[PDB]
């Protein structure tokens, strides 16, 4: 049902690929044809790193399944083929073929559960590699230009945007919170409720020759 | 088996609806008829908020299932009806009907797994809404009468009572720990091992006109 | 019904084998086959001392029953055997045999009530021997190493764990409350909200040669 | 597949029997014959406490299953026996018997899922009893000889050894970190990069009569 | 057997491709079909450098084998083909073909031992090229930004993570141990138990214009 | 050949179960019947810990082999039985049975190589658990009586005795080298070439009341 798919969606974004996602997937995918698992994969393919990890893990699972169950001789025409690894993945197998494999009296192959195990291993790998977050990890570098830091912070917040009013406060506070001190001082030197254009045009001298000369001059001033 | 039901019971109360309860339910409910899932629901219905959440989620799941599989024509008499949403819930379906649906050669409907998914979504919602605890969150308000705070703390501790000796120490320490300072000073003004009646009759003036006059008088005393 | 079994469970752990457990068992076990009494025993077998007491009492009851009703001659084949003591215990007798003994017109033997009396005597003995509790009785010895005391207190609290937040406060307060004074002084010498690793590494000198020398030196200091 | 077994292996050692292991086992064991569950048990039997817990829990599960489904009459020869509790455990049942029970048209018994529930309860008990760790919990006692503490720390680190270079640093730092102060002072009295033989021969006087006399003498020195 | 595969796994990670791995592989691979050797390769393919080395060595071995034993004429249909280099590798040959080659009376070709020699040469090359380790070799560069050094140290420790408590101590000590002095001084300037966010925001000025001016100013201060 | 057995003997004692012993065993055991492997085991059974480890590992290997290849029906009389796990171990199988299994045209079972893998896993476990040595690790404890330390050092040196003249020097030097300082001072207080009886009768007061009084008296002497 689409409501279960929405529940898995909110699990995927609300919970950033924690240890609970593997048992959650095993719970949601019970009694699901590989077609339905593909529809589930459609929504979770948004995360590019997780998407490529699950793609490669499914590819290797399918390759080894084909190695274990190859075709040394063509099947007689008019009969359903044995499920290949890609058939388990659901790409080369239609929903009717999968349901026939489920319901065939002669040695049914639970390809749905096999694909569930494949995606379970993929989600395991994703969890083992997935970093905690990125919005709080956006930290300006001492050599990094401030404009690039602002741009990447904006991209990070837009990737998980919350509310137009909330993101204004995000840009108001977290941008200066993660800013390096040389930019931070000119950021705090103006005052309350900064706006993007004026703060950009005011901070666009940090590290430049004028500010280099100013900082060395003042440093010599307390030296002398 | 009743021992598995007891294991799920201790999971329910020992673990206050954490992220593990959803995979735990999916694990325990495997190979279980909706009748057995109803018996499991009987013990977990104690938590009123979780009970109503799972009730409403099961109701909406059953309603949408009936929408997907309605009855536009009466079934011929003497044959088992198609499983309705309430039949999946097990309320309108007996255990024999569910086991026949499990074991019928002609297109069995895994209603047990469908009800498992329903209760899984319900437990997901419960976890997403469930607050951490209440015994440590019982905190007296500045305007809240102390007797009402004591009564609600007693109810909170009785809801999860531990040991007659332990709860005596609970009332001895946590009651004054969470007490507001005006009541806290009269609570600490007596001494070791307070008892309920005397502490109640001693604290039953906090905020009253006598204590108002006393506090304003002493405040003026250090003012003057 | 499993709900009555859960009620007896909460009676068993909430009430630490008080005088009420014997009449409670007699009340719950009314109209119950020895099979159901065995299922009840399954949950109450958690308490090891009570488990062994009821095991030995049931063994001696069954032995004396076999003495009173032995088999000096084999029964003709195809007929239900007379209920042995183990048959009353339900280990060697199936539920169908017990229900046949209940419902046989020719001199039914109420083996269910006999096993109820057996477990009643066992619970009587358990109550007569059972100590009040253990969590408050965990008291450090003057010679006992503090690490062993902490370990056994942790085991005692884990045996009847209440809440992750509550047990933090348990370790915060009761550990120093039951600590012997030489360890207690170094425990209180740091301050608010101790954590396990630092308190362990700070208290891991009590009774050691350094603290022996320190205490004798200071004692001589007030002596001199 | 052996790769799934390796994934469960890394789950078992990397995650020290957390709350996730129960849903993880339920996920991996789906669609697995009790033979495969026995092969999984082969790798997880390394943990002795967990091994004995799962052994006893499986034994009691099998005993109660045999009580529920005993054999009051021998089966006719040439036919597959009904699955006993040990048959569910897979010890007395071959893989062909289990797959026949899975695929028999006449009332198949999902013994695989029953054994999964058994091992799930066992893992639940293991998690409920399993202590956090041991490498950081190796703490010298005030009376414990330093050589025994070193030996047990070496055994603890060897049980979960990481890297030959890392364990050198482990012995360099954690040994003195968890050492009691009387041994700690002689440990720190030499300097940088200690080696095992010299530190052992230098610390092999702590608590001895010479160090007793030295400490009491110095204590009297600041007393006088 | 999967237990031997697990033994080889623990050999692979516990022993970082030492001189013992070649004889160990020769010992484990005795009496093993190339199919089993492929399953062994599945677990050891985790090490990317070793994986590519063994891939290229197997490819060149197979190419030279095909050169020595080419096919200048198609085999008659219905008969098993002569084992190619890829057939020895097991990719293009099924387990039944390999076992037939093992058991064929007419000049059996020990392709299993040939593939064992191939992987033996690959492991030899891996050992000859494999660096000792990386966790202790993570050393900050004088120009390297501290955040990148922290990130790569975190990746290195996560690649061989040991315990959640142990890695906290790893980040606490080894990060400052391998830190360059300019970052090291601000790292040590705060005190005990640093946490990641505050240490990152405090060290995010090292090498920046403010710290440049500060260091040159103080240097001139002792110069003057 | 017995000379190869002697070579493996000198490998076993000269090399204290290093990483080389596993490939060495795999090298020596090639082309060896389980009978010959049993004769090899006869000499290596001297090491009690290694002996019990290999015994238990062989027992579990044989048990799992019997699980994989059980006997659900008696073999016709006059024919060689299929090799059981104990038959692979060689205890229940004679040399003629093993050589027939080697040389039987119909599906020979390489039981020799299987037992080689079993003992290889056992030697792996032994190496992973085996401590470096014991003769240099014999270190007196601060509370350990000196006579017991001498006795255990004598047992350790006798377990690996070298030469009558060498062991005299061992007792002359290493006994005082590993001795705790309180015993060490009386050991060095006599002079050159001590003999066992006089050193024993001279050191048999360390820790006793006379030496306690002497050490405290002298300590007070430098205190006063």
Helix content of chain A: 55-70%
Please count the beta strands of chain A (DSSP E, at least 2 residues each). 0
N- to C-terminal distance of chain A: 76 Å
Number of helices of chain A: 12
User: What share of residues are in beta strands of chain A?
Assistant: under 5%
SSE order of chain A, one letter for each helix or strand: HHHHHHHHHHHH
Q: Report on the biggest sheet of chain A.
A: none
Structural category of chain A is mainly alpha
Q: What is the assembly state of the chains in this entry?
A: part of a larger assembly
Which two chains share the most extensive interface? C-D, 27 and 31 residues
Radius of gyration of chain A, CA atoms, in whole angstroms:
27 Å
Shape designation of chain A: elongated
Features:
elongated; 6 chains; part of a larger assembly; mainly alpha
């Amino acid at each position: 049902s689409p409501r279960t798919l929405n529940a898995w969606v909110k699990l995927v974004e609300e919970k950033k690929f924690g240890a609970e996602v593997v048992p959650g997937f095993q719970a949601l995918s019970e009694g699901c044809t590989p077609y339905d698992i593909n529809q589930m994969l459609n929504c979770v393919g948004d995360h590019q790193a997780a998407m490529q990890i699950i793609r490669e893990i499914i590819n290797e699972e399918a390759a080894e399944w084909d190695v274990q169950h190859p075709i040394p001789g063509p099947l007689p025409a008019g009969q359903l083929r044995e499920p290949r690894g890609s058939d388990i993945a659901g790409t080369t197998s239609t929903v009717e073929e999968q349901i026939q494999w489920m319901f065939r009296p002669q040695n049914p192959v639970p390809v749905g559960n096999i694909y569930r195990r494949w995606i379970q291993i993929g989600l395991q790998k994703c969890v083992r590699m997935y970093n905690p977050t990125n919005i709080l990890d956006i930290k300006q570098g001492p050599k990094e230009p401030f404009q690039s830091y602002v741009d990447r912070f904006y991209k990070s917040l837009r990737a998980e945007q919350t509310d137009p009013a909330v993101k204004n406060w995000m840009t108001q506070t977290l941008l200066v919170q993660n800013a390096n001190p040389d930019c931070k001082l000119v950021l705090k030197g103006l005052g309350m409720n900064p706006t993007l254009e004026e703060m950009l045009t005011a901070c666009q001298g940090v590290g430049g020759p004028g500010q280099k000369a100013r900082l060395m001059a003042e440093a010599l001033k307390e030296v002398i």
